[PDB]
Write a protein that binds this ligand. Sequence first.
Ligand SMILES: [Mg+2]
Ligand SMILES: [Mg+2]
Ligand SMILES: [Zn+2]
Ligand SMILES: [Zn+2]
Ligand SMILES: [Zn+2]
Ligand SMILES: [Zn+2]
Lengths: 162, 162
Amino acid sequence: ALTNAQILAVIDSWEETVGQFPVITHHVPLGGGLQGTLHCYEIPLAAPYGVGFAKNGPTRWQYKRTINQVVHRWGSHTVPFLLEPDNINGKTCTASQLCHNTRCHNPLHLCWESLDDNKGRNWCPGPNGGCVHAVVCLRQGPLYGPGATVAGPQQRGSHFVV
Amino acid sequence: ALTNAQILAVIDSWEETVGQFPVITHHVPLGGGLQGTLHCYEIPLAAPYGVGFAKNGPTRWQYKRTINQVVHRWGSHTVPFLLEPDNINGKTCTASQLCHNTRCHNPLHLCWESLDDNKGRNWCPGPNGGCVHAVVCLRQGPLYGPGATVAGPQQRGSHFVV
DNA sequence: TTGACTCTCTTAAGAGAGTCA
DNA sequence: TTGACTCTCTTAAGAGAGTCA
Ligand SMILES: [Mg+2]
Ligand SMILES: [Mg+2]
Ligand SMILES: [Zn+2]
Ligand SMILES: [Zn+2]
Ligand SMILES: [Zn+2]
Ligand SMILES: [Zn+2]
């Protein structure tokens, strides 16, 4: 529908509005015991959120723009990638939040990849702890670590061998 | 079912039956460019699956036992952990399959942990690649890798900073 | 053309429970 | 009692679309 020039305008207006969001400084683990800093542009907790934004879920938002009387809407974190392929290896591309802070809409904190790749970053050791992602992580995953396993592999008899 | 003796009975009969499932060898990446061998006891693809087992989904099964005329039924992979706490830090404990082979029911390939710890193993580098899970992984997660990102963080203008 | 809500869907790791014979 | 199916739910990363003034 929209021309590439029109999509650019949509991206530009998106950046301009998100850019005025409260910018919050966050200190985060980078892995290897190092500490870093991230600056998230956070969408408000309740309405109003900003021109073109509306909440469709607890931590889900959409961006709306009307062009030539026809309404267009996109996931709030997807706008930055409107000109990129929308799938790879037969998998749908998703906005992968590098800062692991949902309300953040800083485009420098997002990448475009499959859901499996997206999820995996929750456990990455970080850019300074051994991250191997081609598009490097910005910080260590919130869920990385020893874990909290209640019980490990076990058997009562001798019917099994590893 | 309810008493200690009864639960141990459920576990013992479960191991007995599963102990007769065909044993299939699988060679897997351990990380660090090394490779290992696992022995999975795989439940059949079609009925009959074995005494007490029934398929409730493509890759989901349930174990069923009648104790004192009352029918009890659990998730096929949960039986080994019947005596363990069913939650940790307020999170439901789940049968975490270390061998990443759903049909396998070898208790030596299972642990009891949060769904989050469970999922995270898909991206673990492995026992020889830097795994830090308290209850060590048996192999490198199938999803570990550089990923396939279509587009990284980017901005059109100059309103943002990392 | 817009803002503020509403509701249901996707994935892939995991589950509970009913209908028949 | 035991076997073989059927249908829906949970979680936490992510989505599309309708109503109304
Ligand atoms: Mg993410
Ligand atoms: Mg698993
Ligand atoms: Zn951020
Ligand atoms: Zn990473
Ligand atoms: Zn196995
Ligand atoms: Zn591990």
